[PDB]
């Protein structure tokens, strides 16, 4: 389920601790350290000037890389207050050092409900917000039109409709939309929706 949400991010590279929240009242951080030998590490965080807490790490194969992660508690995560994080080798040498506003690292589901249908305009796209995610009145979407060719139309706060009228005829077209949080919010592009296809007119 969530295994493929994290799978998106891991191609952000090993030099940064990849963290994200699913609904702004939770948080998960991981890094990939291909096995070729576990070792030992420490995960510390500080919330404001509260005494530093320790998150218990967990280990799991991925295939043949190893994924070390941990999960924060809801009382720490539910505030838009900076939160420090730290991963330290047992020798003391620091691996990662990071400050996040949890509201800035939200990763959404893919939007569902994508429909394509001709308009006297010459096509109209509609789709639904990512399910089981609140604050839908603030999502940022993006469509992708492909024929080979690709084009991305940016759609801003709370719109679930596209009015593309500048097309070709007698060509196959493919459409997909992604979603992310938007000026008191931020995060990462969701995976793409399931695509929809439409054979254009003459």
């Amino acid at each position, epitope marked *: 389920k969530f295994e493929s949400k994290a799978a998106l991010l891991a191609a952000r590279g090993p030099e940064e601790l990849l963290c994200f929240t699913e609904r702004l009242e939770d948080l998960v951080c991981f890094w990939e350290e291909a096995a070729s030998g576990p070792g030992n590490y*420490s995960f*510390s965080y*500080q919330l*404001e*000037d509260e*005494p*530093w807490k*320790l998150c218990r790490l967990h280990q799991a194969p991925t295939a043949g890389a190893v994924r070390f992660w941990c999960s924060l508690p809801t009382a720490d995560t539910s505030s838009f207050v*900076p939160l*420090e994080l730290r991963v*330290t080798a047992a020798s*003391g040498a*620091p691996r990662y*050092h*990071r*400050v996040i*506003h949890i509201n800035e690292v939200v990763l959404l589901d893919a939007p569902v409900g994508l429909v394509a249908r001709l308009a006297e305009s010459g096509v109209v796209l509609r789709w639904l917000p990512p399910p089981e995610t609140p604050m839908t009145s603030h999502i940022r979407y993006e469509v992708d039109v492909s024929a080979g060719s690709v084009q991305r139309v940016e759609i801003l706060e709370g719109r679930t409709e596209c009015v593309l009228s500048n097309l070709r005829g007698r060509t196959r077209y493919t459409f997909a939309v992604r979603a992310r949080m938007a000026p008191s919010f931020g995060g990462f592009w969701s995976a793409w929706s399931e695509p929809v296809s439409l054979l254009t007119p003459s």
Partner: antibody
Amino acid sequence: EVQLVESGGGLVQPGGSLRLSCAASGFNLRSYYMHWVRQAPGKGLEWVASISPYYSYTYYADSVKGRFTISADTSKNTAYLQMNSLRAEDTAVYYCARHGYGAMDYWGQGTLVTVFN
Amino acid sequence: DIQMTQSPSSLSASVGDRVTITCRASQSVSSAVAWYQQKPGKAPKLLIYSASSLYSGVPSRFSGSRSGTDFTLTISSLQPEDFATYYCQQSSYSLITFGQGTKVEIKR
């Protein structure tokens, strides 16, 4: 309530040694990062060393490596900075601060180390 | 290493003026950057943290912003108590470095 209180500065010849103390009340020192920062008279701020929570990992500025040692004693809720092989350029007012909000939120009043010839 | 080049090293403004101090990270480093005010004979006092967040009790005329590698602190309407020296601080993994300081003096 929260308070840091330093002691131990003074006058020392070149090459001699001094041990500074940082007594902390109103929070448990074990659960925090602690730093020593020094200020030469008429000059700016220079970080000196840090110590970590629960593991007491120590990190030093390149200038004081080998000669200075940061340490803590949890039973007395005090941090120490033992300075060895003191040079004239070590002369400064020495602060200890407490990690918080991603910076140092609580600083002591500072103690003056004078290396004299 | 990390360098922090603070500019200007001094400025003169009148009471009620808008002032901006700027701090340039020599390089690629985390936005764990804070601002301290220091007055003669006293320890530094934390003003801003996480490059933009006001420390509890600090007046609203203080503001933090970033753009690329440039971190700026702005005081929107100078009051007599604000004339002091200001430092920026950056923390990286273990090294902590400070700007060379900026002294704010009164125009008379």
